[PDB]
Amino acid sequence: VRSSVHARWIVGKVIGTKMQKTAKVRVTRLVLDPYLLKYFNKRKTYFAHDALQQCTVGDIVLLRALPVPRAKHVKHELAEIVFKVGKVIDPVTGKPCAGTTYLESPLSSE
Amino acid sequence: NPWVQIMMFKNMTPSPFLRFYLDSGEQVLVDVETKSNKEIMEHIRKILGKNEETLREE
Amino acid sequence: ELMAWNQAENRRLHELRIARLRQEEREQEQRQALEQARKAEEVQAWAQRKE
Amino acid sequence: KNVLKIRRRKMNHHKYRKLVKKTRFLRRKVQEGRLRRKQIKFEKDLRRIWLKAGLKEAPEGWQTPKIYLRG
Amino acid sequence: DPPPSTLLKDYQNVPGIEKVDDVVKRLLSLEMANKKEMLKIKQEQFMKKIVANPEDTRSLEARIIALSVKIRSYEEHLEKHRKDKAHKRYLLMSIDQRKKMLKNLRNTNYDVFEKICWGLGIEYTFPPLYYRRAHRRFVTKKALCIRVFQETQKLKKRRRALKAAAAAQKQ
RNA sequence: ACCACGAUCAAAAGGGACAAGCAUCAAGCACGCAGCAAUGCAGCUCAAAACGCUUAGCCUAGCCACACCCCCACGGGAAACAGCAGU
RNA sequence: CCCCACUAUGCUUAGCCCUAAACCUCAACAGUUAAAUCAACAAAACUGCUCGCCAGAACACUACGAGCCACAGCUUAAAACUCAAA
Ligand SMILES: NC(=O)c1ccc[n+]([C@@H]2O[C@H](COP(=O)([O-])OP(=O)(O)OC[C@H]3O[C@@H](n4cnc5c(N)ncnc54)[C@H](O)[C@@H]3O)[C@@H](O)[C@H]2O)c1
Ligand SMILES: [K+]
Ligand SMILES: [K+]
Ligand SMILES: [K+]
Ligand SMILES: [Mg+2]
Ligand SMILES: [Mg+2]
Ligand SMILES: [Mg+2]
Ligand SMILES: [Mg+2]
Ligand SMILES: [Mg+2]
Ligand SMILES: [Mg+2]
Ligand SMILES: [Mg+2]
Ligand SMILES: [Mg+2]
Ligand SMILES: [Mg+2]
Ligand SMILES: [Mg+2]
Ligand SMILES: [Mg+2]
Ligand SMILES: [Mg+2]
Ligand SMILES: [Mg+2]
Ligand SMILES: [Mg+2]
Ligand SMILES: [Mg+2]
Ligand SMILES: [Mg+2]
Ligand SMILES: [Mg+2]
Ligand SMILES: [Mg+2]
């Protein structure tokens, strides 16, 4: 379970798929502005190993840290695609949706 | 919780919900539709928050 | 015990959702029934005017 | 409002245009000299690239164009 | 474009329009109408070909189709009016609006996004990451840097063979 | 003491974090990835400030850096108080 | 400044140039007329939200750098010396 990588679990948005078996993921965190005391997004890039090349630009993915980095910049692997771009499945009902509208009514399967 | 990643998403599904990702790999889904923001804070405190005893000891 | 309690809370909220969605279909069907009637008359009137 | 601020700028601009007209032959010789040094400084930058990369001469078939001439 | 003999969208579903005199069929065809009547026929053909409900005009699909027909009409106008700056603006704005629509459709309903791209022949493109002039100095230096990289790759390969050849001689 | 499958302390290595001014420093020019390898792909950083110039020991139970100069010190220039007192 | 004559120019075509007191000197979107209505004048006073911009005067629609079909050009745009005001 141990790992030399700092970020163990992180969610991000895929912003690039031009490297072989590697997805470029943009991860945002809330950082407190000390003077304004307002939280602002701070983004960082992570390379994630994607053995099956299933990532599409724009989908939300969950990254898991590798035991040791497999490359200079590849320290994580694709653990799960949370929200496939344009093919979201509502986790609350399990039905496909398009934005804030259902594509299949939850009443279909009772 | 300065070291916990918090990411927001707008208008991706028909209803609002929270989802927590734990270090073990477990995921905790919390449906928050119809609940007030105070009921949401009290809910997540009960299932994933440290109790007053654990905080006093620290 | 807390994870099992959270899953039971999601199931309770799901039954209230299904009960809420059923009442919205009955209301949606009523509206969709009048719009079709109104839309049918406006089409017949437009069809007679063109004929 | 009065136009005193405009009048100060008016005279500044008048005297500048007159100065440029009076020295337009010297300035044209100065401008020519600057564009030459500008072309040389650009050629040195490209030469620094292939020398630091291990090459001894410019890549085969490369000729640095004159990117600052009127033509 | 639809044939000139095509009837107007309003007189295509009137009973008995196929038994009227030929003169009456001309007066109700695209030949005797302005170009806007022909565009309404093009829009109807794309709807039945692409969208699931050809009667829903407020969906993001119908809007992309309606705007794509307007875009094609602007392109045809500008092919004849190349100094018409007003319509050149309307074209570029319409293309931008369609790209924003396609972006929102790609994010919400990918299956419908693929059918729109195929039906309308649209090649979706992602925007550039940076917006900055590529002036002469930069264009020239970038071309030189690519040549230097290509030449260094050739020299690195010729340093593998010589090392490999000498290594075999020792054996 | 000696072994301590331990504790303490703490290098190298890996991950993360970490000064100021100037954007009239706006592009850097190989800065990526895959593969056991051969080799293949053409990527990587950057206006959320890369690259660069200038200034400055620091976050002070103290810490970092330096130890005549050439970042280093085989070698060379050369012959060393930035230990105390002193000139 | 007044009178006369006449040219570049005003026009067309094809390319450039990219400026204005380009100012209704009043940014876009949404909302209000109640409270304290409000320095003055101007075209009543405000709220939410966002982007752009500003921080004594003058030097300065300048110098330098950079970009540009612009070569007496345009855009971006400082500092030193000076004053206790503007
Ligand atoms: N420079 C970019 O291409 C770029 C890329 C991503 C986001 N942005 C956003 O643009 C805004 C302006 O950034 P800045 O202050 O560094 O620009 P700036 O006005 O200082 O201009 C610097 C460069 O960015 C371009 N730029 C200016 N405004 C832009 C805009 N709205 N969108 C995209 N490019 C623009 C300019 O043409 C120039 O090449 C910011 O909100 C920034 O987050 C800019
Ligand atoms: K030293
Ligand atoms: K102006
Ligand atoms: K005006
Ligand atoms: Mg007056
Ligand atoms: Mg003056
Ligand atoms: Mg160490
Ligand atoms: Mg800027
Ligand atoms: Mg300068
Ligand atoms: Mg820096
Ligand atoms: Mg110093
Ligand atoms: Mg000494
Ligand atoms: Mg030394
Ligand atoms: Mg001493
Ligand atoms: Mg004439
Ligand atoms: Mg005329
Ligand atoms: Mg005007
Ligand atoms: Mg605006
Ligand atoms: Mg000033
Ligand atoms: Mg001017
Ligand atoms: Mg100037
Ligand atoms: Mg200049």
* Cα C34 from Cα B27, distance rounded (Å): 45
* Cα E112 from Cα E120, distance rounded (Å): 12
Contact A78, A55 (CB under 8 A): yes
Residue of B nearest to C4 (CA): B47
Q: Which nucleotide is nearest to A47 (CA to C1')?
A: F33
| Expt. technique | cryo-EM
* Cα C13 from Cα B35, distance rounded (Å): 10
Which of A9, A15, A45, A41 is closest to A28 using CA atoms?
A41
Non-local (6+) Cβ contacts of E117 within 8 A are E102, E123, E124
* Cα D61 from Cα D49, distance rounded (Å): 16
Contact B31, C10 (CB under 8 A): yes
Q: Which nucleotide is nearest to D49 (CA to C1')?
A: F29
Which of B13, B58, B3, E157 is closest to A101 using CA atoms?
B13
Ligand 1: nearest atom to the Cα of E130: 3
* Cα E129 from Cα C1, distance rounded (Å): 48
Non-local (6+) Cβ contacts of C13 within 8 A are B31, B33, B34
Contact B7 A91 (CB under 8 A): no
In angstroms, the Cα distances linking D43 to A11, E140, E145 are 47, 11, 13
Structure tokens at D43: 């050629």
Closest C-alpha residue for ligand 1 atom 4? E130
Contact D69, D35 (CB under 8 A): yes
Burial (CB count within 10 angstroms: exposed 0-12, middle 13-18, buried 19+), residue A88? buried
Residue matched to tokens 């829903």:
E56
Alpha helices per DSSP H over E8-135? 22-27, 35-50, 60-80, 85-108, 110-120
Which of B6, A25, B16, A58 is closest to E108 using CA atoms?
A58
Pairing mode, strands A9-19 and A60-65: antiparallel
E127 lines ligand 1 (CB under 6 A): no
E149 lines ligand 1 (CB under 6 A): no
In angstroms, the Cα distances linking C27 to A12, A105, C20, C30 are 40, 15, 11, 5
Structure tokens at E4: 């000139």
Whether chain E has a CB inside 8 Å of the CB on A79: the answer is no
* Separation in Å, CA of E120 to nearest CA in chain D: 43
* Cα D12 from Cα E83, distance rounded (Å): 40
> Which amino acid, D70?
R
Contact A85 E111 (CB under 8 A): no
E83 lines ligand 1 (CB under 6 A): no
Which of A68, A86, A71 is closest to A21 using CA atoms?
A71
Contact A106 C21 (CB under 8 A): yes
Residue B20 CA distance to nucleotide F35 C1' (Å): 36
* Cα E50 from Cα E60, distance rounded (Å): 12
SS3 assignment, position E55: coil
In angstroms, the Cα distances linking C44 to C37, C40, E14 are 11, 6, 11
In angstroms, the Cα distances linking E12 to E47, E65, E72, E95 are 16, 21, 24, 31
* Separation in Å, CA of C2 to nearest CA in chain A: 18
Which residues from chain C sit within 8 angstroms of residue B26, using beta carbons? 3
* Cα E121 from Cα E46, distance rounded (Å): 11
**Chain F positions with any atom < 7 A from a protein CB:** 13-17, 26-35, 39-48
Calculate how far, in angstroms, residue C20's C-alpha sits from the geometric centre of ligand 4: 61
> Which amino acid, A93?
T
Domain boundaries, chain A: 1-109
Can you say whether residue B53 is alpha, beta or left, with left for phi > 0 and alpha for psi between -120 and 50 degrees?
Answer: alpha
Calculate how far, in angstroms, residue E14's C-alpha sits from the geometric centre of ligand 2: 97
